[PDB]
Amino acid sequence: ELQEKLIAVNRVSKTVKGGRIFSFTALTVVGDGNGRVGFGYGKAREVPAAIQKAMEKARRNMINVALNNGTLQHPVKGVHTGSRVFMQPASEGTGIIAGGAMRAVLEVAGVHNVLAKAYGSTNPINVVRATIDGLENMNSPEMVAAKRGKSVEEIL
């Protein structure tokens, strides 16, 4: 019912008196295909357990995206750590033109046609967080008109 997508499974490790303890991290995204997307990051000593933890966290943390006909509303910039992303609406048929983490985020969020570039670092976690920030700060004509106190036609 909610579309799942595993992005990166990265093996980290901490050092202890005996030696090294190798654990695993899983990054996932959940989305219904219609503007409701969230991301989850989970650690466990084992990859399936990490994936399940990420799944639960992602399902518990979703945000609303004001999609427009399966594409974005206007050009947006998503900024987090060392990752900047730019996302631009595209006419239908364009498909999703983005990197790895951004592709996962948009495919599960339900965007069907978008152009996107990722400047700065391309670490999957920060890329995901920047993309989600950009989507959650993307406006829509209805609420833009509402906040400005005008009508949708009077805005466009």
Binding site: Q73, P75, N139, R148
Partner: protein, 129 residues
């Protein structure tokens, strides 16, 4: 020294919206009054008033919707160090249309959509979104 009062006005509004001040006060100008007219009439501020005949002080009332500020972004484009002039067919879009581009055209200060209506170009004073 103060080498761009227009940028000063925009920065005052930006900082005021950030700090939740109800009104922001500043020195007045013809151009500042015109920009305030444009912003008010497209609903980015409530009201503005210029009080004083020797040192005219302009006061702009800022508006917040559900708690959040309305002027989410406001940028000075044609700055003194790099003036920007655009023709009626390269007038920019702000927020892909939702935003506005305050443009000084030959007939007064008036947004990009209105300039495209009246077939004018001019100096892109600022972007508002």
């Amino acid at each position: 020294s103060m080498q761009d009062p227009i940028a000063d006005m925009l920065t005052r509004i930006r900082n005021g919206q950030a700090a939740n001040k109800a009104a922001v006060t500043m020195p007045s100008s013809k151009l500042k009054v015109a920009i305030a007219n444009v912003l008010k009439e497209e609903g980015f501020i409530e009201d503005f008033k210029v009080e004083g005949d020797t040192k005219p002080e302009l006061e702009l009332t800022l508006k917040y919707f559900q708690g959040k500020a309305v002027v989410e972004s406001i940028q000075r484009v044609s700055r003194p160090g790099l003036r920007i002039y655009k023709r009626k067919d390269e007038l920019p879009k702000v927020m892909a249309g939702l935003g506005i581009a305050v443009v000084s055209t030959s007939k007064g200060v008036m947004t990009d959509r209105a300039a495209r209506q009246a077939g004018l170009g001019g100096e892109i004073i600022c972007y508002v979104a």
